[PDB]
Curated annotation (Swiss-Prot), chain B:
<dbReference type="GO" id="GO:0008768">
    <property type="term" value="F:UDP-sugar diphosphatase activity"/>
</dbReference>
<dbReference type="InterPro" id="IPR004385">
    <property type="entry name" value="NDP_pyrophosphatase"/>
</dbReference>
<keyword id="KW-0963">Cytoplasm</keyword>
<dbReference type="GO" id="GO:0018279">
    <property type="term" value="P:protein N-linked glycosylation via asparagine"/>
</dbReference>
<dbReference type="InterPro" id="IPR015797">
    <property type="entry name" value="NUDIX_hydrolase-like_dom_sf"/>
</dbReference>
<dbReference type="GO" id="GO:0006753">
    <property type="term" value="P:nucleoside phosphate metabolic process"/>
</dbReference>
<dbReference type="GO" id="GO:0005829">
    <property type="term" value="C:cytosol"/>
</dbReference>
<protein>
    <recommendedName>
        <fullName>Uridine diphosphate glucose pyrophosphatase NUDT14</fullName>
        <ecNumber>3.6.1.45</ecNumber>
    </recommendedName>
</protein>
<comment type="subunit">
    <text>Homodimer.</text>
</comment>
<feature type="short sequence motif" description="Nudix box">
    <location>
        <begin position="112"/>
        <end position="130"/>
    </location>
</feature>
<dbReference type="InterPro" id="IPR000086">
    <property type="entry name" value="NUDIX_hydrolase_dom"/>
</dbReference>
<comment type="function">
    <text>Hydrolyzes UDP-glucose to glucose 1-phosphate and UMP and ADP-ribose to ribose 5-phosphate and AMP. The physiological substrate is probably UDP-glucose. Poor activity on other substrates such as ADP-glucose, CDP-glucose, GDP-glucose and GDP-mannose.</text>
</comment>
<dbReference type="GO" id="GO:0046872">
    <property type="term" value="F:metal ion binding"/>
</dbReference>
<comment type="similarity">
    <text>Belongs to the Nudix hydrolase family.</text>
</comment>
<feature type="domain" description="Nudix hydrolase">
    <location>
        <begin position="39"/>
        <end position="207"/>
    </location>
</feature>
<keyword id="KW-0378">Hydrolase</keyword>
<dbReference type="GO" id="GO:0019693">
    <property type="term" value="P:ribose phosphate metabolic process"/>
</dbReference>
Length: 218, 221
């Protein structure tokens, strides 16, 4: 989560492996309709509870999409259509902290040879520094995210760890990610504080752990 | 959520008045970087608890993007790049139920002069037929939906309603041709509804049920 961002500029977006524009044409109950959407990948998330530190493991990082959307709120029109000349430097622009979010460890399912559990284990090592095995993972929920513009499905896993599995670092492969250990005592106040940029996966992860897992511990 | 879907095809979308893909170029830790994202407005959601029926109020509708993703999920390559020879008929296709989702009532922060609570009330009227008062909405949470591809912020509201407050029809706006069905989920079987993986549900529904049962339901009796 290196909040140090410079040279922020918005340019044209032609072709991406992550954003593929498509149109579904269809008839619903006889009525001809169309819908423009983006083909994107499914994903997985994992909530880790470190029972030694009595803390939940989260990740903090810079999200360029969040930063861009935040520049638009405080300076309307900053994200207008870019001409063919080249990327337009965002002026005025916000500090990189505007794009800094707190999330669950997450990763895309964009490699055909890895299971959902294997993607979750790979991401927990690269981002959080914890050694996980697929047999240590439990499925919490599988849901659809962004039903309006994408049909992506995200699967949330839960797992319990100690420092004995933190045999190395996260922070991406080098990617700049800061690992966050949230003590259980202040976890609910963390999730409810709008001053922190959080995802729904974090709010639900914390809420689900405290209401269903924590009362059955010890 | 009429599940009769026919003629499903996928077409190239070169120019879309609804899609706004952009790329952010920036400098971080001294190493030039780029990121592909979509400019989307913010949104609101509202969870309703009908005390007269002791049921949470949800919406069910056909989501074309969800349908396409499920066809692709069962038949990879269904959404391969489309050539210039018109729309490509989806063959094989799936029954329309594969795109039918259960969601919370939700709308976009696009109408000027309307606060977040108002936009939520208008969506509850247009989609669920309930007439709400904005000052009666309790703010549950505010958060960044889809941080990887969008910078949109979503705010969730909650309020209790009665049968008498359902002073409007259902369905949404017929201007877009929307076909939205209202669902009343009984309270004693709501958690099993959110855990059963055999229904296309959003995280907002799963969190909404969980939050209601642990933060609102004990204080009712
Ligand atoms: C935020 C999200 C959960 O809700 C949405 C998002 C987009 C559309 C949409 N609405 N529309 C209309 C616009 C104008 N009306 C008259 C016809 C079609 C689209 N068209 C192409 N792609 C589309 N994703 C849409 C609807 C609901
Ligand atoms: C919530 C999360 C699971 O969703 C994501 C995550 C990352 C990207 C993305 N990741 N990347 C690269 C970054 C550098 N390398 C090392 C990894 C992939 C992108 N590049 C351009 N646009 C992009 N939307 C991306 C998209 C969606
Ligand atoms: Mg990763
Ligand atoms: Mg609507």
């Amino acid at each position: 989560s290196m909040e140090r961002i410079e040279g922020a500029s918005v340019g044209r977006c032609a072709a991406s492996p992550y954003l593929r524009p498509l149109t579904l044409h269809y008839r619903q109950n006889g009525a001809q309709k169309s819908w423009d959407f983006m083909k994107t990948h499914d994903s997985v998330t994992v909530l880790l509870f470190n029972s030694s530190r009595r803390s939940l493991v989260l990740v903090k990082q810079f999200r360029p999409a969040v930063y861009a959307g935040e520049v638009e709120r405080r300076f309307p029109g900053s994200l207008a259509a870019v001409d063919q000349d080249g990327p337009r430097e965002l002026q005025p622009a916000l500090p990189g902290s505007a794009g800094v979010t707190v999330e669950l460890c997450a990763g895309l399912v964009d490699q055909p040879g890895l299971s959902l559990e294997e993607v979750a284990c790979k991401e927990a090592w690269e981002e959080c520094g914890y050694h996980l095995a697929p047999s240590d993972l439990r499925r919490v929920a599988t849901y659809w995210s962004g039903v309006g513009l994408t049909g992506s499905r995200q699967t949330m896993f839960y797992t319990e760890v100690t420092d004995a599995q933190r045999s190395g670092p996260g922070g991406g492969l080098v990617e700049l990610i800061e690992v966050v250990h949230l003590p259980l005592e202040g976890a609910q106040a963390f999730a409810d504080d709008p001053d922190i940029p959080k995802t729904l996966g974090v709010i639900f992860g914390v809420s689900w752990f405290l209401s269903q897992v924590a009362p059955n511990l010890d």
